Assembly symmetry: D2
Homo-oligomer: 111 residues x 4
């Protein structure tokens, strides 16, 4: 169960994760189906079914999304990425901060 | 302007140091949490994240991952670099703390959520 | 898309939502299919309200008062209709664990989703 | 010893009043939000929740829904009643704000999250 490869989630978004170095660091591109491509950066815990997390630095909005989850192996043997994300929006005054963070899930399978 | 480069501390007492943010918003840093839950020892862990460059906002959004060096878990933060009314820089963040579970059926319980406020140290 | 009825979620949990009165208030029971405690699962009550402002697909929220654990879970979502006319309860929940000292609060809340269909 | 009955105020400046908590831990009350993002005039809204009764812990957990009367949204709070070193009662809570979207395809963006700290008013 390694994050490298092409992934697709329930919303139809695509994700491509490059190589994961010894420290667990990886890069990739994120193709969002709902709102376009944007780079992503994250690391995977090193110490089989590891936990991971990455940031998606969007290039068509001021927002930032972070994903985190675990690489599982289904009963049938397929790799499944079960993750949750926080989508931070850009507010002007810090008084509007209470409404800036959304939350949700995404399930990825090998594209 | 509010830049993440610097040394920060949050309401739990954890300390965070963020290096330089390059022309694309990518940065790296270390995280020294004040709290834990594992049987192992607390250790300065690396963090990798990015800062939004769209419009070069003076209060941009950001998000980074903390790859813990003593726990099997992973934590992701995201928030906004804010400038107070007095003029002090403050980070308003929310984090997800993914736990490691061997059963994919145990996945429903492997994600904690919380907040964190950061100021310069 | 009324909440009244019996529902089942992706985790295999069942919940029966009684009648929703004029103000949107409703009561019911929740039979969770999963737990990590050592205690035996036990049907627990739920109390929640439904938004009446204006709808075909209203937003709602309800608390589950667990009777076998010291914790508390709250759900909130929207009643949707599919392309095949099927009712779906898309929800997210916050699971509050009981901690000893307020200092241990940071690690007390879990988060997740649950999709419901009529049983 | 830490009961939710009484009038509370949060870090945002909002106020709520929690009536009586019965044997089963059920309770109702009122919530007057201090902030909002709709131009509709903020209108006092009812709330329904329940307190955990297992073991009658001095610091129980709780949750309640707030049925907004001036918006199509719903917010759920869950937390714990604490007694700090000083002796004051505090409510540590996290909330989900479910927005009303038209189609089920917009559902992914209909739930916000945050915290609130309440102290007796
Ligand atoms: C939710 O309800 C369904 C149906 O009412 C339950 O399904 C039954 O589960 C038992 C347990 O193994 C089986 O022996 C029955 O054959 C099932 N019946 C049907 C019609 O499927 C289900 O167990 C309930 N879930 C929980 C957690 O109680
Ligand atoms: C709510 C919304 C639309 C959020 C902001 N969206 C964007 O900027 C588009 C880029 C992010 C969308 C991808 C998310 S990310 C998690 C989820 N998982 C997945 O695969 N796609 C989705 C824009 C503003 C703030 C204006 N509004 O508010
Ligand atoms: C044991 C297990 C599964 C793992 C725990 N991981 C740790 O102990 C590593 C220490 C770093 C975490 C610090 C968090 S990170 C966000 C917040 N902000 C801050 O500064 N500290 C806290 C976690 C849990 C409780 C899930 N359990 O217990
Ligand atoms: C830490 C842990 C394992 C988690 C919590 N476990 C419980 O609360 C007991 C089981 C009842 C909760 C059912 C949830 S609710 C959302 C999800 N959706 C669904 O259908 N079931 C699940 C708290 C404590 C600390 C007791 N334990 O220990
Ligand atoms: C504008 C719209 C569609 C509706 C908004 N609904 C409202 O205006 C109704 C009242 C808001 C409740 C106040 C929250 S509740 C948790 C927190 N604790 C507290 O005391 N206040 C805040 C919501 C948003 C802006 C998301 N969307 O966009
Ligand atoms: C994802 O990849 C598949 C296969 O290449 C393609 O059919 C689909 O259109 C892609 N979706 C997006 C949003 O790029
Ligand atoms: C953070 O730094 C300050 C000053 O350098 C120090 O007093 C404090 O103990 C540090 N906290 C942690 C958790 O390392
Ligand atoms: C909450 O109560 C205080 C106490 O007087 C009051 O000043 C404040 O206006 C109240 N909040 C709102 C939103 O009315
Ligand atoms: Na504003
Ligand atoms: Na298990
Ligand atoms: Na403690
Ligand atoms: Na739409
Ligand atoms: Zn990059
Ligand atoms: Zn690294
Ligand atoms: Zn009850
Ligand atoms: Zn009511």
């Amino acid at each position: 169960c390694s994050l490298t490869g092409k992934w697709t989630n329930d919303l139809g978004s695509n994700m491509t994760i490059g190589a994961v170095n010894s420290r667990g660091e990886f890069t990739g591109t994120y193709i969002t189906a709902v709102t376009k491509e944007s780079p992503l950066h994250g690391t995977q815990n090193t110490i089989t079914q590891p936990t991971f997390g990455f940031t998606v630095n969007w290039k068509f909005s001021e927002s930032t999304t972070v994903f985190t989850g675990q690489c599982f192996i289904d009963r049938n043997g397929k790799e499944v990425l079960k993750t949750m994300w926080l989508l931070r929006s850009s507010v002007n005054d810090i008084g509007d901060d209470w409404k800036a963070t959304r939350v949700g899930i995404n399930i990825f399978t090998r594209l």
